Amino acid sequence: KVFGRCELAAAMKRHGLDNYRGYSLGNWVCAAKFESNFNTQATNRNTDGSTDYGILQINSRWWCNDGRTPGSRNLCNIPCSALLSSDITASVNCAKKIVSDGNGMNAWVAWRNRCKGTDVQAWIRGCRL
């Protein structure tokens, strides 16, 4: 599914991400924009052989199992394919664990490089939330 900006904001809110670990909804929307362009089916191979999956480009090296990432973990206890679903529940639940891991949203390099410190509230501007 390719979400609209306010559609995804609404879904993330409904799923408990608004201010999760102190990160306003705009931060989550901004991260999703630059990780996946709001596309739940987004996949990208990393140089290390791992693959990132979904709306929030969660990595197969720690967080989900894809059967092809040697020496990896599956800390979210899910198949990476669950992260490509139109239903964002699995991605949100796993992102909750990632952002709680110690470095907050810096775990998402594109959040750090493109969202951090910016006017992230722009991302939820005009949404009925």
Min dist. Cβ of residue 120 to Na ion (A)? 30
| Residue 57 CB burial class (10 angstroms; 0-12, 13-18, ≥19) | buried
Min dist. Cβ of residue 60 to Na ion (A)? 4
Is there a catalytic annotation at residue 7? no
Which residue in 53, 55, 52 sits closest to 86, CA to CA? 55
Q: Contact positions toward Na ion, by CB under 5 A? A: 60, 65, 69, 72, 74
Binding window for Cl ion (CB under 5 A); candidates: 34-42, 44-52, 53-61, 73-81: 73-81
| Whole-number Å distance between alpha carbons of 75 and 46 | 18
Restricting to residues 25-44, which ones interact with Cl ion according to CB under 5 A? 25-26
Min dist. Cβ of residue 21 to Cl ion (A)? 6
Q: Which is nearer to Na ion, 18 or 52 (CB)?
A: 52
| Whole-number Å distance between alpha carbons of 52 and 80 | 8
**Strand pairing report for 51-53 and 58-59:** antiparallel
Is there a catalytic annotation at residue 87? no
Catalytic positions, please? 35, 52
